[PDB]
Amino acid sequence: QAGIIRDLLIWLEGHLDQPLSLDNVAAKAGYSKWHLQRMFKDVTGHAIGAYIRARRLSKSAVALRLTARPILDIALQYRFDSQQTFTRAFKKQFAQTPALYRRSPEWSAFGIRPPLRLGEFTMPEHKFVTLEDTPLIGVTQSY
DNA sequence: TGCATCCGTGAGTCGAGGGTAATAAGTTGCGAGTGAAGGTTTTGTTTTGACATTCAGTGCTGTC
């Protein structure tokens, strides 16, 4: 029912990292590999399988732009199979070399796909301002 | 048959504090060896045909 898929993503957003998962591992959620896939297609508007590894790449794209690791820390970190295939699907998502992607300081959100909620989404508000050069005092350290 | 001379020997385990200081000619010629780093060469990270699967995709197919 509608209470299932919402609870599956509470697993899945927390288990987008730890299990090396395809839909066979996702088939342990009450029904078969196809029926859990059939139950997702209409209650969401997204198609689960190519989305998740792309969402796990979208989890890896912010890891490719704001985390301090090289290509092979994050080659198979997000449960992938190869690096050149990971480089390949990246071209169909961001149209940029990952060496070129962390070359430019500008980070545009083209291929990052948002995390899905079947329940109610807490929408933040926006207001566009233009700020001023203000002196302060503080120290720096890294992570 | 003595008489001189010339080498070669002399506690054990500790200890402290710490290596110091003369004087002197130059111009001129001129090859050889850090050196500016100029610049290539490699020895590795990235594009593109593939097509062989694979699971993802969507729906039907059959079922409690």
Nearest to A108 by CA among A64, A69, A139, A141: A64
Amino acid at position A65, single letter: R
Which two structure tokens, joined as six digits, stand for A13? Answer: 């957003």
Q: Which nucleotide has its C1' atom closest to residue A100's CA?
A: B46
Strand locations in A76-129, DSSP E? Answer: none
Return the domain boundaries, chain A. 3-56, 57-118
Is residue A99's beta carbon less than 7 angstroms from any atom in nucleic acid strand B?
yes
A74 C-beta less than 7 Å away from strand B = no
**On the CB side of A112, how many CA atoms lie within 13 Å of its CA?**
12
| Closest-CA residue to A38 (of A4, A10, A11) | A4
Expt. technique: cryo-EM
Nucleotide with minimal C1' distance from the CA of A87 is B46
Positions on chain B within 7 A of a protein C-beta = 45-48, 55-60
Structure tokens at A38: 């059939």
Q: What are the distances in angstroms from CA A44 to CA A7, A40, A47, A102?
A: 13, 6, 8, 33
User: Side-chain half-sphere of A39: how many Cα atoms within 13 Å?
Assistant: 19
